[PDB]
Symmetry: C3
Subunit: 366 residues, 3 copies
C-alpha cells in the first residue's frame, strides 16, 4: 500500500527542474564560451535538438528499459510510453511520474555533456545517430545496472548521484569521439553557475526524498565544490603563478563531479578531502585527444569520486557506514569494478555508435 508523500513530490519535481536547468541552458552556455565563436550557434542548436530527442526516447522506451524489471543489464518494454504506470503509481515515496521526469533529466544532462563537447567537429545527423545508439545501449543499461537494481547495484556498488552513470560514462564516450575524429569567459562562468545551482537538484534529488540524506548530499555538494575550487586555484597559483577564471570554474566542476557518487554516503570531513583531491586531480588531468577536457575533468574526477566513496562512506571516516558485512577492502574492489565496467561498456558502445554514423552519413562535418 505505497503512499506518495506530497513533500517528496514537491522536492523531486523542483529537483527535476534544477537538473533540467543544467542542460538548458547550463551545459549549452558552458561550452558556448569555450568553443570557437563561429561554432556556437550550431552547438546550442545541437544540444537543444538532442535534448529534445532524449526527452522523447526516454518516454517511448528509455524509462521502461532503464527502470523496468528485467535482468542484470536492462529492464523491459511494457512501460512503453509509460503504459501500465497508473498516474497514481508510487515509486519510493513519490509518484512514479516524477521518477520518470527525474531520471529523464539525468539522461538529458549526460547526453548534453557529450553533445556539447563534440558539436564542433561532428556532423549533425551523425550525432543524432550516435545519441540514439549510445543512449540506448550505454546510458540505459548502465542506469539500469547502477540505479535500476541491476548488476552493479546487486553487488553493492556505491554511486549516489552518477559518477559512473553520468560522468565516467560520458567522459569515455567523449574520448572515443575525439580519438576517431575560450572566447566568452563570462558565458563560461554563467554556465558553471547554472550547472552548480542545477547540481543541488541532481545530488539532493538522488535521495528521492527531502530527508537527512538529501540534507547531507546538499551540504557535501557545497563543501566539496568549494574545496575543489580552492585546491585547483592553489595548484594553478603554484603551477602558473596565478588563478584564472577558467581554473576556478574548472575547480568547481572537478569537485561537483568528485562528490557526485559520494555526496549521500560521506561526512563533511570526507566531502572536503574529496573536493581537494578532485580539484587537484582535475587540474593534473587537463595538464596531461580530449574534447573540451571532458575526460580530464569528468573522467579523472569521476574515477576519483567513485574510488573515494569506497573509503569515505565508512562510519569511522564520518560516512553513513558501509552495508552489513562489507569491509572497506571489498567495497573498494566493487567500486573499481563499477568503474572498469562503465569505462569498457561506454567505450565499446561509443565505438559502435560513431561507426554506425560514420558508415551511414559520415562523422567529419562536411
Amino acid at each position: 500500500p505505497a503512499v506518495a508523500d506530497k513533500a517528496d513530490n514537491a522536492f523531486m519535481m523542483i529537483c527535476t527542474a534544477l537538473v533540467l536547468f543544467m542542460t538548458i541552458p547550463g551545459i549549452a552556455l558552458f561550452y558556448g564560451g569555450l568553443i570557437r565563436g563561429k561554432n556556437v550557434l550550431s552547438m546550442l542548436t545541437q544540444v537543444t535538438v538532442t535534448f529534445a530527442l532524449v526527452c522523447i526516447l526516454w518516454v517511448v522506451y528509455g524509462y521502461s528499459l532503464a527502470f523496468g524489471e528485467g535482468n542484470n543489464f536492462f529492464g523491459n518494454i511494457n512501460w512503453l510510453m509509460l503504459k501500465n504506470i497508473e498516474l497514481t503509481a508510487v515509486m519510493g515515496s513519490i509518484y512514479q511520474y516524477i521518477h520518470v521526469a527525474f531520471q529523464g533529466s539525468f539522461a538529458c544532462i549526460t547526453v548534453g555533456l557529450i553533445v556539447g563537447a563534440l558539436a564542433e567537429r561532428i556532423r549533425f545527423s551523425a550525432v543524432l545517430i550516435f545519441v540514439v545508439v549510445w543512449l540506448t545501449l550505454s546510458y540505459i543499461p548502465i542506469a539500469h545496472m547502477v540505479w535500476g537494481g541491476g548488476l552493479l547495484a546487486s553487488h553493492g556498488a556505491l554511486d549516489f548521484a552518477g559518477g559512473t552513470v553520468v560522468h565516467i560514462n560520458a567522459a569515455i564516450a567523449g574520448l572515443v569521439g575525439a580519438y576517431l575524429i575560450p572566447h566568452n569567459l563570462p558565458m563560461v562562468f554563467t554556465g558553471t553557475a547554472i550547472l552548480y545551482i542545477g547540481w543541488f537538484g541532481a545530488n539532493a534529488g538522488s535521495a528521492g526524498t527531502a530527508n537527512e540524506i538529501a540534507a547531507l548530499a546538499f551540504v557535501n555538494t557545497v563543501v566539496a565544490t568549494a574545496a575543489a575550487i580552492l585546491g585547483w586555484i592553489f595548484g594553478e597559483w603554484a603551477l602558473r603563478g596565478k588563478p584564472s577564471l577558467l581554473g576556478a570554474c574548472s575547480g568547481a566542476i572537478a569537485g561537483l563531479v568528485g562528490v557526485t557518487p559520494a555526496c549521500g554516503y560521506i561526512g563533511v570531513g570526507g566531502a572536503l578531502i574529496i573536493g581537494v583531491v578532485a580539484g587537484l586531480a582535475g587540474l593534473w588531468g587537463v595538464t596531461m585527444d580530449d574534447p573540451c577536457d571532458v575526460f580530464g575533468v569528468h573522467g579523472v574526477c569521476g574515477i576519483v569520486g567513485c574510488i573515494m566513496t569506497g573509503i569515505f562512506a565508512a562510519s569511522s571516516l564520518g560516512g553513513v557506514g558501509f552495508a552489513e558485512g562489507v569491509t572497506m577492502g571489498h567495497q573498494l574492489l566493487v567500486q573499481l569494478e563499477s568503474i572498469a565496467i562503465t569505462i569498457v561498456w561506454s567505450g565499446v558502445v561509443a565505438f559502435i555508435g560513431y561507426k554506425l554514423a560514420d558508415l551511414t552519413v559520415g562523422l567529419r562535418v562536411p
Copy 2:
C-alpha cells in the same frame, strides 16, 4: 475547516518563483536578442517597469477582481490591498497569500509577452496606459472567466494553465498593437531556456498542489516541448534544408504554449501528439503584421492547444477523462467558444487601450 498543507505551500511558493523567473529576466532576454540592438535597453526597462506596475495593480485591485466572488465576468473590490484576507486564510490546500503571488506572476508574464513584443515601436507612457487598461479590462475578466469560477469555467472550459488567459489573450493584444502601429541568438536561447525552466512552475503549479496531476503536467510539459522542437526542426529541415537555433528555440515555445491548456488533463501520448502538431503549426504560422511573431506562435499554438485539449483529455485517448455527462463533441464546442470569447474580448479591449494612449500621449514613439 480548510487546512493549509505545508508541502503544497512549499511547492506553490517555489512555482511562483519559477513563473516570476519567466518574466525577470526570461521574456526580457528572449526579446533582448531578437530586437534591434539599439532598442534593447529601452525594452528591458519597459518590461521591468511594467512588471512592477503589474505587481502593484494585482495587489491593489487585481487579485480582488480576478478572484473574488462576483458575476460571470469579474469578482469584486473588498480584497483591495488584500483586506479581509486573513494571513492564515486557505485557498485550496495552500495559504491564500501564495495563491495571490502565484496568480499575480501569471499576470506579470502575460503582460511581459505583450510589452516585450511592442517595446520597440510604442511610447513608454503609451504602453503604461495600455497595460493599465488591458490588465484591468481584459486579463482580469478572462482570468476570472476561466480560473475565477466565471463564465467559461461554469460552462466546462478546459484550460489548465492559460492557453486563453495567457497565450491567446496576449497574442491578440499584440496583433491589435501591430495593426494600429535577430542580433544576439545566444541571448535568445538563454531566454528560451529560462522560459522553459520557469514554465514548469506555471504548468505544474496550476495544479495548486504537489500531487499526481502536478506530476502529469510536469511530465507532459517535458514531452510536448521536446515533440514540438523536433516537429519544428524537422519541418524547418524540409522547408529550409536545415534546422536553425531560432527554429529550435521557437519549437520549444510552440509546444510549451500548445501544452499549456492541456498539460493537466492529457496522457503522454497526447502530450507528444500535441507537441508535434503545435511545433508544425507554429512553424506554419510564422511562415504565414505580427510583432516578433507573437501571434504566429502564441496565437496559433494557443488555439491548437485549447482545441486539442477538448480531444486528448478523453480517457479513451489517455486523458484524465471529461467531466460527467460531457462528450468530446460538446467539450470541443466549449473550447471553440472559450477561444472565440478570448480573441474578441482581448481584441476589443486592446483596441480601447491603445486608442486611449493614442488620444492622451500618442502611440508612435517620438
Copy 3:
C-alpha cells in the same frame, strides 16, 4: 522530541539553492556589467574563490561560532566541522544540516556583495585576508547577535532576513574599503534578475518553514520591490526627465533591501510604503567615496528598512504585531541601536581587516 518536517526540509533546501543562485552567478554578473570590462574576469574569479573560501570557513568554524550556544556576541567551537551535530539533529522544524546550508548561503552572498564591489581596486591576496578577518569578526558575531539568540535578538530587535546582518554590515565594510583605497547593461539586468528570484529564497526561507509567514514574506518581497522600482523610476523621471535601465534595476534592489528586515513582520500596505520610501531614498543616496554605490543602496536602504520595520510590524499598521509589552516607541529605539551597533561593529572590523592585509601583502592592486 523535535521532529523534522519533510515539507520544511524541501522548502529550505530549495531556498538555500536560491540564495546560492544570488552569489553564483547573481552578484557576479550584476557587478560584471558595471565595472570596467578590463576588470571583469579578475572580479568573477575573486567572487568565485571567495565564495569557496566562505563555504569552507562556514563549515570549519563559521556555523559553530555563528550559531552555537555561547555569549551575547559569539557561539562556540564544538560544532567544528559540524561535529556533535547528528545527521538527524533537528533545528526548528528542519534538519540542522539544512540550517547550516541556509545560513552559510547568507554568509556567502554578504561576502559576495563586498568582494564584487571592491574587486576592481584591491589585491587578490589582500581581499582573501580581509574576507577571513571580516567574516570571522564581523559577519559571524552580528549573525550570532541577531539570528543566533545573541545581544540584539535578546533585546527584541526585528530583522527578519538581514537588513543588519547582510546589508548594513556589508555596506559599511564596503565604505571603509573605498575610504582607505557601466559597460554591459543587459548583464547588469540579468544579475538584478537572478538576484531578485534568488531573494525569495532569502526572504521566505528566513521563515524556516513553508507557512503563512513564509507566504507573507514572499508577497511583501514582490510588492516592495515593485513599489521601489516605480518610486525610483518616477524620481528619476523627475530628476533626469527619463527612467533608465540602471535606475530600474537599482530600484528593484533598493526595495529588496528595504523589505529584507521587514518582510516577515509587515502587511502588504507596509510592504508598498516601504518599497516606495526605499526606492526614493536609494535614489537620493546615489545622488549624494562609495564603490558601486554599495552604501548608497544597501546602507541607505538597509537603514530605512530596519527603522521602518520598527513601525510597520505594528498590528495597527497591518503587521504581525510587536511582542508583548513592546511599544512602537521602544521598538524603534531598539532598531536604532541594532543599526548603530552594526555600523560601528562592521566599520571597526573592516578597518582591522583591510589594515592587516595592507600590512602583510598590501591593498593597492600592484
